[PDB]
Amino acid sequence: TXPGVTXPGV
Amino acid sequence: XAXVXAXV
DNA sequence: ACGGGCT
DNA sequence: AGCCCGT
Numbered sequence: 404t405x406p407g408v409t410x411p412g413v
Numbered sequence: 414x415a416x417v418x419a420x421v
Numbered sequence: 422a423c424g425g426g427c428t
Numbered sequence: 429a430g431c432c433c434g435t
């Protein structure tokens with residue numbers, strides 16, 4: 404996720 | 414065919 | 422027939 | 429530690 408907590412996705 | 418991790 | 426991307 | 433797709 405994010406970053407943080409990429410995306411999703413990417 | 415999506416690329417959201419692979420992109421085929 | 423397919424695995425990616427930083428805070 | 430943190431998710432999830434379409435031709």
Ligand SMILES: *C(=O)c1cnc2ccccc2n1
Binds near residue numbers: 415
């Ligand atoms: C892309 O649209 C798509 C849909 N289904 C798949 C299944 C398996 C591999 C790649 C795929 N790509």
Ligand SMILES: *C(=O)c1cnc2ccccc2n1
Binds near residue numbers: 417418424425432433
């Ligand atoms: C891409 O690396 C990747 C991996 N697993 C998945 C599961 C479900 C939807 C999309 C995905 N993409």
Ligand SMILES: [Cl-]
């Ligand atoms: Cl999978």
Ligand SMILES: [Cl-]
């Ligand atoms: Cl903990």
Ligand SMILES: [K+]
């Ligand atoms: K924990």
Ligand SMILES: [Zn+2]
Binds near residue numbers: 424
């Ligand atoms: Zn897979």
Ligand SMILES: [Zn+2]
Binds near residue numbers: 418425
């Ligand atoms: Zn991976």
Ligand SMILES: [Zn+2]
Binds near residue numbers: 429
């Ligand atoms: Zn880690």
Ligand SMILES: [Zn+2]
């Ligand atoms: Zn899963």
Ligand SMILES: [Zn+2]
């Ligand atoms: Zn599908």
